[PDB]
Amino acid sequence: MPRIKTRRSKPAPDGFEKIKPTLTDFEIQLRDAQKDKSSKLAAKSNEQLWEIMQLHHQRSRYIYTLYYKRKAISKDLYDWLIKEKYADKLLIAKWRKTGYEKLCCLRCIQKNETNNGSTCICRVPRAQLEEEARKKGTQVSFHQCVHCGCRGCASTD
């Protein structure tokens, strides 16, 4: 259940070893993300965080492609992963939904947190923002979702 190898934790299933190196390259990078590389500026700080979120996304995307696309692993290996926190159950579940296939996070679809209305501009297709931009001819001022670093979760882009 915990990430740790605590004695209660059941040993790995069969297909594990083949993918262990690919996962380790993620782990060793997260070590480097939280090492507290100091920065004075705010922008740089929440950039540092954006690193972590994106890494987490990439890992869970890797596993999701293994089980729900290529079916390159067993069900038992999968469930054993989820129980060991190598993946994000809820996030994957959003990916299986129709509209969310490329999604950032689970914050970005939070309706409650955001002030009015909801769902970061992070979720709005570039196709449109270019159009409302076109009305103003000011181009478009959006770059990164402050929570994530996303640019266009929306699954068209």
């Binding site: 994106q54 490329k102 950032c104 570039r126 196709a127 670093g149 996303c150 640019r151 266009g152 979760c153 068209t156 882009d157």
Partner: peptide
């Protein structure tokens, strides 16, 4: 807009999905 237009259009972004930078 059209599906071909979108499919072609996206690869423009530098780095896959979705952190890949437009421009």
């Amino acid at each position: 807009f059209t599906k071909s237009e979108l499919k072609r259009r996206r690869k423009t972004r530098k780095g896959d999905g979705p952190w890949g930078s437009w421009s």
